[PDB]
Write a protein that binds this ligand. Structure first.
Ligand SMILES: [Cl-]
Ligand SMILES: [Cl-]
Ligand SMILES: [K+]
Length: 164
């Protein structure tokens, strides 16, 4: 298990534009195109992203390409965020992957509201952090995925993904 395999499980792989759990145009492996309700707008974002006139469908390789970029950018942003870098640095590799996964899903902006949870992680108060994390719109809207992420923060193991 690793960040790529974990997010592949969590996001799936689709080669045509589709809408994510929030109703937003996405493609590939969780690659958010835009929050605009305009499909053409989405398609334009896709073409810009891939570098060609696609007509809304991409190859697996292309999908993987955006994914790699996406994972990298997620890490990079965490490293550049003064509110997150410290948490990230205080963690073991398994938990770090869970934090990257969260940011990939909700963004740094979405992570701003987790200050308290992040603090519990920093204190290594695993069960306390787990309880806290669950008290969020994030958990309520994507409970199965959030539960997985939370078990990783709680245990430092991949057990939640192990059988998927
Ligand atoms: Cl992009
Ligand atoms: Cl879910
Ligand atoms: K998805």
């Amino acid at each position: 298990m690793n960040i790529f395999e974990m997010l592949r499980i969590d996001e799936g792989l689709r080669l045509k534009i589709y809408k994510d759990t929030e109703g937003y145009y996405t493609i590939g492996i969780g690659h958010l195109l835009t929050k605009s309700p305009s499909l053409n707008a989405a398609k334009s974002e896709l073409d810009k992203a891939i570098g060609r006139n696609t007509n809304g469908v991409i190859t697996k390789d292309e999908a993987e390409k955006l994914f790699n970029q996406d994972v990298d950018a997620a890490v990079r942003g965490i490293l550049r965020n003064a509110k997150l870098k410290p948490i990230y640095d205080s963690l073991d590799a398994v938990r770090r992957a869970a934090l990257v996964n969260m940011i990939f899903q909700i963004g740094e902006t979405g992570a701003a509201g987790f200050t308290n949870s992040l603090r519990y992680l920093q204190q290594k108060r695993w069960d306390e952090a787990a309880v806290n994390f669950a008290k969020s719109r994030w958990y309520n809207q994507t409970p199965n995925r959030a539960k997985r992420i939370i078990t990783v923060f709680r245990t430092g193991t991949w057990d939640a993904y192990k059988n998927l």
